[PDB]
Amino acid sequence: QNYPEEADGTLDCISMALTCTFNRWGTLLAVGCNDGRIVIWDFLTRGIAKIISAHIHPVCSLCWSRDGHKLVSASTDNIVSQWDVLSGDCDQRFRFPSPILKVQYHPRDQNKVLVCPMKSAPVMLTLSDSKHVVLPVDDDSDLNVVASFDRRGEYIYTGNAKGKILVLKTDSQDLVASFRVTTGTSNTTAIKSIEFARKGSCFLINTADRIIRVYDGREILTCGRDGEPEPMQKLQDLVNRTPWKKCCFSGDGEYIVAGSARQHALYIWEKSIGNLVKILHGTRGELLLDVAWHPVRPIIASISSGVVSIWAQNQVENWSAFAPDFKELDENVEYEERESEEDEEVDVTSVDEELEDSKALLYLPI
Amino acid sequence: GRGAKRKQQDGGTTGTTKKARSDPLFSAQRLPPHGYPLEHPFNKDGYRYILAEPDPHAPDPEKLELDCWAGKPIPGDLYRACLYERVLLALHDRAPQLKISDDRLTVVGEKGYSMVRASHGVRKGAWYFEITVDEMPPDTAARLGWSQPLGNLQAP
């Protein structure tokens, strides 16, 4: 329905919890603990699934495969390994010259993982033959670039550290579209990151000019090589100037959520009207790590400092649900009474949108 | 000597109590707020209460001051709440939830079920009359037809 209006407590099966993400509609939580282990918690069921002894140095990011059989982890010790969801061991192991920021799996190509190396071009590693394909970039090759798929993963978008954004194909790598961000009034600005959605092909861009902007993944291939920047709403906070660390898109396709760093100010807007509707009242003292809504149902769940805070819509059905012909309501009007006082032989056999991020096949009742 | 009024107000011991209850929306009647031709349809189906055709009574209940109704009752010449020539429905055998115009032409019901009866019988002669249903909103039953005074005025 509308934005979440109730508050939920914490979900700490184990004390430490660094990163969190929903799979397709919030099934399981991928906790990368700060001890070199990979823990999986249960969402909407409040439990745990599997603990994996990955390596010694802790990890800093997590994502799952398109077929749900892999647990990719952007390690802090350059362990690009394909941990198995089922058995928990390592299926494929590889090493990259630069660490990884954002790991994602194309919902139509699990072979080519998403890697965001630093001071080097993004690299797609093919799980079928352990081959690395460098994404062709423009100008510099030593910038803090972040690479990310579109809704369908059919085009890949990269952001550099001088003001240039690149558009190319996820598999053909035909770099035929660029974009130059606005240069403010006197000084240029780099790009920190971009973040996408599951409907509408919109995407937020976080830059170094302290202002969060929004574009759509359809006006760059339409304009051609490079055109003039033209965002919809240059949203920002103009009373405290909080910097921005992590912000995701809505679970419906019409809202925008932005996260603070230490001020406990979680801001929300809607794409139709850029007017503030509500603000989150968080208890000061912790640093926010990850935010990602339920991809279907409006709810907010932010991880921070090893714990997690959820603002939700706690619901229990009304007492008047005993039977359709039975109601427990109150009225002061006189009762309106009623005014209107086969044979076949067939057995019974019958038992946002949806994408391909399923088949985790991980559930241990005992 | 002042207990007679309290006995008359509580209800006494003369059958039905002296505290009326006609809680549905009762209108079109009880015009003069004094001792004159009046009517009180009661909650209890079958109670007809009227004051027209007045009567005297025995004075001196408890040796108080001489009541004016001893042998010479006060007269009355004002509105009488009934009809003679041909009662358009009635004003006595009714339910206290029916809204009628001052000229007694329109009949408006309650939030719940309601009826109006009449006060004229038919034995011989032609009585080819009509009931023009002005309007009938949804969930408003408009069954019409003859009935009997014994019929419960709130029963379907």
Swiss-Prot record, chain A:
Tissue spec. comment: Ubiquitously expressed.
Keyword terms of this UniProt record: Chromatin regulator, Isopeptide bond, Nucleus, Phosphoprotein, Repeat, Transcription, Transcription regulation, Ubl conjugation, WD repeat
Cellular compartments annotated: Nucleus
Residues covered by region (Interaction with WDR5): 342-351
GO biological process per UniProt: DNA damage response; response to estrogen; transcription initiation-coupled chromatin remodeling
WD repeat extents: 12-53, 54-93, 138-178, 186-225, 239-281, 283-321
Effect of mutating E345A: Significant reduction in its ability to stimulate KMT2A methyltransferase activity in association with WDR5 and ASH2L
Positions carrying Phosphoserine: S340
Crosslink feature (Glycyl lysine isopeptide (Lys-Gly) (interchain with G-Cter in SUMO2)) location: K119
Modified residues (Phosphothreonine): T242
UniProt keyword Methyltransferase present: no
Effect of substituting V346E: Significant reduction in its ability to stimulate KMT2A methyltransferase activity in association with WDR5 and ASH2L
Phenotype upon changing V348E: Reduced ability to stimulate KMT2A methyltransferase activity in association with WDR5 and ASH2L
GO MF annotation: an example: transcription cis-regulatory region binding
This protein's GO CC annotations: histone methyltransferase complex; MLL1 complex; MLL1/2 complex; MLL3/4 complex; nucleolus; nucleoplasm; nucleus; Set1C/COMPASS complex
Record's function text: In embryonic stem (ES) cells, plays a crucial role in the differentiation potential, particularly along the neural lineage, regulating gene induction and H3 'Lys-4' methylation at key developmental loci, including that mediated by retinoic acid. Does not affect ES cell self-renewal. Component or associated component of some histone methyltransferase complexes which regulates transcription through recruitment of those complexes to gene promoters. As part of the MLL1/MLL complex, involved in mono-, di- and trimethylation at 'Lys-4' of histone H3.
Record's subunit section: Component of the SET1 complex, at least composed of the catalytic subunit (SETD1A or SETD1B), WDR5, WDR82, RBBP5, ASH2L/ASH2, CXXC1/CFP1, HCFC1 and DPY30. Core component of several methyltransferase-containing complexes including MLL1/MLL, MLL2/3 (also named ASCOM complex) and MLL4/WBP7.
Record's protein name: Retinoblastoma-binding protein 5
Curated annotation (Swiss-Prot), chain B:
Positions of post-translational Phosphoserine modification: S22
GO CC entries: histone methyltransferase complex; MLL1 complex; MLL1/2 complex; MLL3/4 complex; nucleoplasm; nucleus; Set1C/COMPASS complex
Tissue distribution: Ubiquitously expressed. Predominantly expressed in adult heart and testis and fetal lung and liver, with barely detectable expression in adult lung, liver, kidney, prostate, and peripheral leukocytes.
Main location: nucleus
GO molecular function: beta-catenin binding; transcription cis-regulatory region binding; zinc ion binding
Transcription regulation in keyword set: yes
Organism superkingdom: Eukaryota
Biological processes per GO annotation: DNA damage response; hemopoiesis; positive regulation of cell population proliferation; response to estrogen; transcription initiation-coupled chromatin remodeling
Signal peptide start and end residues: none
Modified residues (Asymmetric dimethylarginine): R2
PTM text: Both monomethylated and dimethylated on arginine residues in the C-terminus. Arg-2 is the major site. Methylation is not required for nuclear localization, nor for MLL complex integrity or maintenance of global histone H3K4me3 levels.
Phenotypic consequence of R2K: Abolishes methylation
Keywords on record: Acetylation, Chromatin regulator, DNA-binding, Metal-binding, Methylation, Nucleus, Phosphoprotein, Transcription, Transcription regulation, Zinc, Zinc-finger
Compartments where located: Nucleus
Subunit record text: Interacts with HCFC1. Core component of several methyltransferase-containing complexes including MLL1/MLL, MLL2/3 (also named ASCOM complex) and MLL4/WBP7.
Role summary: Transcriptional regulator. Component or associated component of some histone methyltransferase complexes which regulates transcription through recruitment of those complexes to gene promoters. Component of the Set1/Ash2 histone methyltransferase (HMT) complex, a complex that specifically methylates 'Lys-4' of histone H3, but not if the neighboring 'Lys-9' residue is already methylated. As part of the MLL1/MLL complex it is involved in methylation and dimethylation at 'Lys-4' of histone H3. May play a role in hematopoiesis.
Annotated protein name in UniProt: Set1/Ash2 histone methyltransferase complex subunit ASH2
Species of origin: Homo sapiens (Human)
